[PDB]
Amino acid sequence: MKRTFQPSVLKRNRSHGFRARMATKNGRQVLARRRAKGRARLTVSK
Amino acid sequence: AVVKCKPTSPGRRHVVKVVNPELHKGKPFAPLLEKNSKSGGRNNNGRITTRHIGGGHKQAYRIVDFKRNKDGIPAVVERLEYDPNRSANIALVLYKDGERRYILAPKGLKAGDQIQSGVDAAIKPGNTLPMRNIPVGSTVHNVEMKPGKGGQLARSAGTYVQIVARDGAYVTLRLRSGEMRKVEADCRATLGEVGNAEHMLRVLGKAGAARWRGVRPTVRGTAMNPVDHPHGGGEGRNFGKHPVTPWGVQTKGKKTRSNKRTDKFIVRRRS
RNA sequence: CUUUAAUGUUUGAUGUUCUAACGUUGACCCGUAAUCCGGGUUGCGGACAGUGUCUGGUGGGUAGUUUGACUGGGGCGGUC
RNA sequence: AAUUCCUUGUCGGGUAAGUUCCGACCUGCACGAAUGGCGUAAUGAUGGCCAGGCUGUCUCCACCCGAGACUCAGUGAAAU
RNA sequence: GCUCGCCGGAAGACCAAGGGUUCCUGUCCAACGUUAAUCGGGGCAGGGUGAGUCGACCCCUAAGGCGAGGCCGAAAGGCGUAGUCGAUGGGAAACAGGUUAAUAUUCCUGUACUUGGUGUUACUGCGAAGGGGGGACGGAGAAGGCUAUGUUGGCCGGGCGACGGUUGUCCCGGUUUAAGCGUGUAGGCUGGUUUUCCAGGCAAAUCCGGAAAAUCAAGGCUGAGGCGUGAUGACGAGGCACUACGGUGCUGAAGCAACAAAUGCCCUGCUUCCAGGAAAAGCCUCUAAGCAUCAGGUAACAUCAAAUCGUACCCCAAACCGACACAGGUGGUCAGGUAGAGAAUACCAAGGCGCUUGAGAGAACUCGGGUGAAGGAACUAGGCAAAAUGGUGCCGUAACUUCGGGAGAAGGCACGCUGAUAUGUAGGUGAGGUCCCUCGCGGAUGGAGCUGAAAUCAGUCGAAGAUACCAGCUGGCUGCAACUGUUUAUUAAAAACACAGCACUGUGCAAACACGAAAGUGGACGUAUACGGUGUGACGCCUGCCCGGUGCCGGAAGGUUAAU
RNA sequence: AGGACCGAACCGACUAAUGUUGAAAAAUUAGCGGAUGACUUGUGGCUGGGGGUGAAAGGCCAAUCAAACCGGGAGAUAGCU
RNA sequence: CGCGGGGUGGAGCAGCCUGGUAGCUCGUCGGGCUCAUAACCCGAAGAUCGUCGGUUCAAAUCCGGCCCCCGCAACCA
RNA sequence: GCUUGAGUCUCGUAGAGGGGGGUAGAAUUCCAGGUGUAGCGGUGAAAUGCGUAGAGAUCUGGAGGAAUACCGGUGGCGAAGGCGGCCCCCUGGACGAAGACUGACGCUCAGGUGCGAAAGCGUGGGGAGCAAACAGGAUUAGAUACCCUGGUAGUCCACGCC
């Protein structure tokens, strides 16, 4: 049948995009953690 | 007027259309027309607030005139427009000065009729004058609670308030629900009952009639499960509770009157 | 003391009247090219209404919980 | 009876034969009037039942054509 | 290479989304490829994506987001005004041809077009976030005109033939041409032109609206398609020349007519229904502030500029999403021939393709099919499955009914091919000629040619003429639900849920009720013929008794009664 | 005209067989219902965990839903294996 | 079978849970009323408590056994 | 051809004739309020009912709906059903006078068509009084009734059936 993942770059960035993470303190705190963890991909972008 | 529809398909069998040939069949006068977006019964949070309502066919908001602030100016009526947003049909008035304004159409109105506002105008239906000058007992509509408010009472089609008595700035009204209520004499009111009294004789007919009227289907309490509503459960349509609204407030005979501050205006209450 | 008159006074209730607190999802004006908001001039109510602290009722709308054991399987029944 | 326990109630209809079906009787274990009563044309990938047509569903299977199974070569899993 | 088979409203050809080099060319077979593999969407190297006109960006905005101040909140923060983002919608402009191992409406050859800037010249009141017009919108239906496109003939070129005939009414192929510029047609809409006046469009307005007159009755807008030009050009069947021998260079015939005909276009039109059907900017216009010698605007001419990013390839799949080169999934555009009502189906063209293991054998048994004596539901929980019915025209058609139905009821009949009516008709199309005209894309008359059903009759073949694919099983009694619908994705499609209708009940507007500890939203820019909730569920005939228990509403005398 | 009739695209998912370490973590083949609407679909938005949404099955909320997933409390607690 | 509720003049009900001598309505009998019967008025009678045994000085009552009537339970795979 | 039937015209007369729209007063009911105190109401007799929460009586004010006293009559008008306050508007028919005019155009009428009390039925209003159904109370052998206290459709209005 039709599967659960149906990519749309536009929709992908509106939600998990960098600037959408900069939105609220909850998001920025995500970035704080991911840097702290030393993770390569800070957030999804390319 | 009322036209019962020949059976041809089920759901057509029971339909009774209300035809009004006298109503204008062309497009609305454009200047007065803003868009009206569908709330779908949802607020700012986005949560649904009122169930039943949503969907429906698109419609635009006619800016109807209520305050009737233009005074002493003759106004010739032009055509009776259909208004999707309300029940009553709205007349497209044309003043001598050149401005056009929509207004709720009184019963006895025809195209080309002369009507006027102001403290003088006259007793001919459709004229709006401050209630202090209206004779005791006569019928009026589009009554204002406060001057300049625009209009509140008796706007739905076929509805009319009946003045009963006057004392001081106050003037008693017999509302359409039968509830007596005082109001300020300075308030304006339009003579004559509102038109399209046969609106209630419309019997829509098929289920779809309601859908595009903008009302979505209703699910009854008993059908739902305990968790979704105070009623529910049972293996065999069991009930055994006192009827309540979904949020637990008692229904079926429970008074909900609360304001307290407005009680001085109310005299009799509905029975 | 008894049965009770009036004045003054302590406050208490009820009602009427007034407005200066307060309300105004009434009108008009200004910031202002802004049906937000503020300020003002009004009118409308008006010491109510509404809010705080205390307090009686209601309260499965919501939450936390209890709902025994024996027992010729267990529930029922009986028993402690 | 989508309710009827005793029950395959009793009578009649339909079948050579009918615990089902249809129509009746009323002792309604324990129907019943908007948690609706009783009728109802049309509608139904709806429940029950009887006919006509149709046939390998069956009496009783028979043969045939294709894809696997089978042998040779290459590759080469699994639960346990 | 030859042959054979399959799709052909796709298993073809373009895109979007999404991938991110998989495209092409050389080289390699380690692994990957379900086998081998010289091959490859694998490895390795090199190469390849050209735009003023396509698209994005950009101008504008919907729902919706963010939100200076602001109101609100233990804090984080919530809501939201001005504003500012946000296409899936609106906004300026290009086509045909040729070309590459791979790109093209981007390169080249032609022929265009648009928006600006700047300057020159001639005329001139310009100027707004303000005013107004416009932009700007539903569904359904019906018809007429058209075109794509095809068919047939004509024309041109080729052929005259492996085994009977075949220079003839014979066979085979080709017969294409754009945008723009000109012309303004079918056809649709609309009464125009002038003067004067104004309680209006927040101020003004020569605009808009409105009211008077005068005056002529046509004027204007809209517009497919055709016709010219563009185009004495290109393309072109094929020949002529060599061929890294794969192909490249050289030359070039005809290039019309009629007929049929779209779901495309005129048509966001017309008619009609109610369920009554986006904003905003570009654009046109009106002036205010402001500036009048200006500045600025209008027209013409010239000249410059038009940036930046995407552009390969796949794209109903082997490259996207399903752990895989997986029988799954995914939106848009084009849509040829014969038969057919048809985008169904059968066979084909264009164009791809034979599904990455094969080769034998021809047991049981399993899968998918074909057929069957006689009987015909005896099978079985049950006709489950199969079988059968199946098309068009005509005849004919019951109980019941809400008078529409039921009803394609049931049940029958006819149907091929040839000829004649008619050396192809009824129709449709409409030439030539002729006539008329306030003359052209005009109208009448006229019938050439073309196309062309259906019917009757006569004959004739086969067992069978709706011969294939395609293509209703029907009838009777009865339960339940009125009906179309919806539902447990991934075992339940129902008698459940909805439903129109019905009743009760709440709500007088700062409404009830809901979301938010609040501001505030929805309710609703609605107002008791409205809105909330609860129950029943079309329609017909109806809805009987009980207010003791419980709940709600109403009454406050008396009793009891918290904080204070 | 119509929540009209027959029936393709399209949407649904009624019956049977195959398949049940599948071709596939629900499909295929033959039939099946709707098919101008309470239709269907693209794109983009909005609603959130005792919350959403629900023509209501306690269905659906990223293959899980009588209370999602992820991290922390947390080495919870287990008279039980 | 497990339990609960009862059994009372001719019929239906009390009475009994607190053991000291069984009441109500109707029916019956008789006498009046009426031409006669019904209705009506007056009076009287009738059971000495399902039943077999305990208990206590005394049992309708309390207890146990038995015979009938009534209702509930009689289940889970 | 005739005017003696039938009809038309000319000016009048009376009428609860019909339809539509307004309007008045008395009374019943209810609601607010004032005074006021223990019964009221009802019956053959009672009770049910209402009332120390202040009834009924009484007074002022308001709100409603219905029907229209007396006049009113072995009176009137209408085809029949039927029609009663006052007033407006639209409108039918009858009767009389004096003539004038038309010139048998007449009479009856199957089928047809129209109207047609009350009740009843539909849709939507309104709802005072009365009142089927229903409740209670009595009365009775019983009383599903007569009688009493309440009371719903209905009675009323508009249209449509019957």
Side-chain angles (χ1 to χ4, degrees), chain B:
Chain B
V2 160
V3 181
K4 184 181 57 180
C5 286
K6 298 286 188 76
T8 64
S9 55
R12 192 64 168 181
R13 185 175 299 276
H14 300 285
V15 177
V16 169
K17 291 190 297 189
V18 172
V19 178
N20 188 345
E22 296 295 323
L23 177 150
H24 190 57
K25 65 179 47 180
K27 290 177 186 172
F29 180 74
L32 295 181
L33 187 76
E34 58 188 342
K35 55 179 307 164
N36 187 27
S37 67
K38 268 69 180 175
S39 188
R42 311 171 177 274
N43 65 18
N44 293 148
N45 294 129
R47 309 283 178 85
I48 201 182
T49 56
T50 299
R51 322 176 279 96
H52 306 34
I53 67 177
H57 187 286
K58 176 175 294 177
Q59 62 184 16
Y61 178 70
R62 319 295 194 272
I63 304 92
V64 183
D65 183 65
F66 295 139
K67 182 182 174 172
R68 298 293 294 277
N69 58 343
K70 277 184 189 306
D71 300 330
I73 296 168
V76 171
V77 171
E78 178 172 8
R79 44 181 198 182
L80 288 176
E81 287 302 321
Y82 179 62
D83 177 8
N85 212 332
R86 315 164 170 286
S87 72
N89 310 122
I90 56 180
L92 177 65
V93 171
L94 173 66
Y95 291 98
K96 292 304 292 190
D97 63 13
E99 179 172 2
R100 289 191 171 91
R101 292 192 171 180
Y102 288 96
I103 64 115
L104 301 174
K107 192 169 177 180
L109 186 69
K110 282 172 194 182
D113 287 341
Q114 185 69 255
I115 62 178
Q116 186 184 167
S117 308
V119 302
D120 190 8
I123 302 308
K124 183 184 181 180
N127 301 330
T128 299
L129 54 99
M131 281 183 290
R132 60 190 170 186
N133 309 126
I134 302 178
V136 170
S138 50
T139 288
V140 305
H141 71 268
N142 196 29
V143 177
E144 292 174 357
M145 296 307 202
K146 302 173 178 183
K149 181 61 176 311
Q152 297 293 335
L153 310 172
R155 288 159 62 171
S156 177
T159 303
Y160 63 88
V161 174
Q162 175 177 3
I163 296 173
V164 172
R166 178 172 183 183
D167 182 14
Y170 290 138
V171 174
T172 63
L173 295 186
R174 179 173 302 102
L175 299 176
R176 192 42 190 162
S177 78
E179 179 166 4
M180 294 301 292
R181 178 169 198 289
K182 300 168 80 65
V183 295
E184 305 177 342
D186 295 343
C187 303
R188 295 168 181 282
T190 309
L191 296 175
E193 61 284 356
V194 177
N196 180 4
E198 301 174 344
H199 182 70
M200 63 176 309
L201 298 177
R202 171 165 299 102
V203 301
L204 296 180
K206 55 175 175 186
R211 288 304 302 269
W212 59 54
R213 194 62 65 187
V215 193
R216 299 188 57 246
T218 296
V219 182
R220 295 165 299 87
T222 54
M224 300 175 163
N225 280 86
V227 54
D228 302 330
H229 186 294
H231 319 151
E235 300 289 324
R237 289 176 178 175
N238 315 316
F239 196 76
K241 324 164 159 69
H242 310 282
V244 283
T245 72
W247 295 276
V249 179
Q250 177 59 62
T251 193
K252 197 159 295 295
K254 172 72 158 171
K255 292 294 188 42
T256 50
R257 188 68 176 70
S258 191
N259 293 287
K260 263 63 181 180
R261 98 180 161 76
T262 57
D263 287 347
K264 45 169 312 181
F265 300 154
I266 290 178
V267 188
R268 294 289 179 184
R269 188 187 176 76
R270 180 182 62 267
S271 188

